[PDB]
Design a protein around this motif. Structure first.
Motif, short mmCIF file in Angstrom:
data_model
loop_
_atom_site.label_atom_id
_atom_site.label_comp_id
_atom_site.label_asym_id
_atom_site.label_seq_id
_atom_site.Cartn_x
_atom_site.Cartn_y
_atom_site.Cartn_z
N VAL A 56 -4.84 47.07 25.99
CA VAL A 56 -5.26 45.99 25.04
C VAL A 56 -4.76 44.62 25.54
O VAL A 56 -3.56 44.50 25.78
N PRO A 57 -5.63 43.58 25.68
CA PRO A 57 -5.20 42.26 26.13
C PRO A 57 -4.62 41.44 24.99
O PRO A 57 -4.84 41.71 23.81
N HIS A 58 -3.82 40.44 25.36
CA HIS A 58 -3.26 39.48 24.43
C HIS A 58 -4.05 38.19 24.52
O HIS A 58 -4.34 37.70 25.62
N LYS A 59 -4.36 37.60 23.37
CA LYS A 59 -4.93 36.26 23.37
C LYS A 59 -4.52 35.60 22.07
O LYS A 59 -4.81 36.12 20.99
N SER A 60 -3.78 34.49 22.17
CA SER A 60 -3.28 33.85 20.96
C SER A 60 -3.25 32.35 21.15
O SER A 60 -3.11 31.83 22.26
N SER A 61 -3.35 31.65 20.03
CA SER A 61 -3.55 30.21 20.04
C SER A 61 -2.24 29.44 20.06
O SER A 61 -1.23 29.88 19.50
N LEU A 62 -2.29 28.28 20.70
CA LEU A 62 -1.20 27.31 20.73
C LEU A 62 -1.79 25.98 20.32
O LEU A 62 -2.01 25.09 21.15
N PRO A 63 -2.12 25.82 19.04
CA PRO A 63 -3.08 24.79 18.65
C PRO A 63 -2.57 23.37 18.83
O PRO A 63 -3.38 22.43 18.86
N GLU A 64 -1.27 23.17 19.01
CA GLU A 64 -0.71 21.84 19.23
C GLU A 64 -0.18 21.65 20.65
O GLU A 64 0.58 20.70 20.91
N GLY A 65 -0.58 22.51 21.57
CA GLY A 65 -0.05 22.48 22.91
C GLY A 65 1.36 23.03 22.96
O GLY A 65 1.87 23.62 22.02
N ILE A 66 2.00 22.84 24.12
CA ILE A 66 3.36 23.28 24.32
C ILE A 66 4.17 22.10 24.85
O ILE A 66 3.66 21.00 25.02
N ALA A 67 5.44 22.34 25.11
CA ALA A 67 6.34 21.25 25.47
C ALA A 67 7.45 21.81 26.34
O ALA A 67 7.63 23.02 26.44
#
Ligand SMILES: O=C[C@H](O)[C@@H](O)[C@H](O[C@@H]1O[C@H](CO)[C@H](O)[C@H](O)[C@H]1O)[C@H](O)CO
Ligand SMILES: O=C[C@H](O)[C@@H](O)[C@H](O[C@@H]1O[C@H](CO)[C@H](O)[C@H](O)[C@H]1O)[C@H](O)CO
Lengths: 134, 133
Positions: free
Chosen positions: B1-12
Motif C-alpha cells: 500500500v503506498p502513502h500519499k498525504s498532504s502538506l497544505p502549507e508547505g514545509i520549513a
C-alpha cells in the motif's frame, strides 16, 4: 551508565536532529538531555529535557546566568523503567520539537538564540545505546 | 500500500519525514517524493529513488515536466529483504537523507520549501510507518 558529551563547535541550525536511543534502568530516578552554550560547569542551557521517573513528569527548561527559567511540562510520561526509548530533539526556526516513540511529545519555543548552542550532554539514570546529531 | 498525504502549507527547516519499512526480497525500486501539487506530474522538490535493480540511489527534482541534474548517493544502504529507517530532514539549504545510523546524502534545494504540498511513498516497498514531524 556512561554519559554522552560532545561538542558542536559549528553550532546547530534549523534542521538539526538529535536522535537518542537507549533504556531506562529498572531503578531509574531521572535523566536529562541538555543543549548547552559552553563547556564550563553552570553554562547556560538552551534546552534542558528532563524525564523524571521518580516524580512522573517530563520537565523542559532553559538556564541563563545560573538561574533556571519557567518550567514547561509535557503531557504524561512516555518513559518506563526497564523499557527502551527513542527520542528525537528537532531544531526549527521557532523551537525544539521533542518526539518520543511515534509521536511529537512537546514543542519548546526558543528562549536563548539557537546560535548559542555548542555542546550536547546526555546523562543521569539512562543506558545509552546511541546518540547522534544529524 | 503506498502513502500519499498532504502538506497544505508547505514545509520549513526542521520538518522531518521518518519512513520505516522493509524492502521486499524481490524489490526492484521504490520512491519517496515531495511534490508541489496533486494534479499532473506535479513538480517534485525531491524525488528519492532507491534502485535495487540497478544498485543506485538517485535524487532529483522536476520542474514543468523536466528533470533536473541527477545526484547519486554513495553505495546503496538498502537491501532486498531488509528493514530500513529513512529520515528526510529539511534545512534552509537542502534535504539531509539519513539511512540507518548515518547521513547518506545532502541534496541542496532546487525548489522552495514553501511550495511543497504532498508526500508520496510507493513502489516496491512495505511501509510500517510514515511520519511528518
Ligand atoms: O517540582 C517542581 C520544582 O520546580 C522542581 O522542578 C525544581 O527542580 C529543578 O528543576 C530544574 C529544571 O527546572 C532541574 O532539573 C533541576 O535538576 C531540578 O532540581 C526545583 O528547583 C526543586 O524542587
Ligand atoms: O541514469 C540513468 C538515467 O539518467 C535515468 O536515471 C532516468 O530515469 C529517470 O530518473 C528520474 C530521476 O532522474 C526518475 O527516477 C524517473 O522515474 C526515471 O525514469 C532516465 O531519464 C531514463 O531514461
Amino acid at each position: 551508565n556512561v554519559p554522552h558529551k560532545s561538542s558542536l563547535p559549528e553550532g546547530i541550525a534549523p534542521g538539526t536532529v538529535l536522535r537518542i536511543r537507549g533504556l531506562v534502568p529498572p531503578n531509574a530516578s531521572r535523566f536529562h538531555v541538555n543543549l548547552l552554550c559552553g563547556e564550563e560547569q553552570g553554562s547556560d542551557a538552551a534546552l534542558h529535557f528532563n524525564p523524571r521517573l521518580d516524580t512522573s513528569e517530563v520537565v523542559f527548561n532553559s538556564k541563563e546566568q545560573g538561574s533556571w527559567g519557567r518550567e514547561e511540562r509535557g503531557p504524561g510520561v512516555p518513559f518506563q523503567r526497564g523499557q527502551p526509548f527513542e527520542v528525537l530533539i528537532i531544531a526549527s526556526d521557532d523551537g525544539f520539537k521533542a518526539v518520543v516513540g511515534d509521536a511529537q511529545y512537546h514543542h519548546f519555543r526558543h528562549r536563548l538564540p539557537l546560535a548559542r548552542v555548542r555542546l550536547v550532554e546526555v546523562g543521569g539514570d539512562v543506558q545509552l545505546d546511541s546518540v547522534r546529531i544529524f
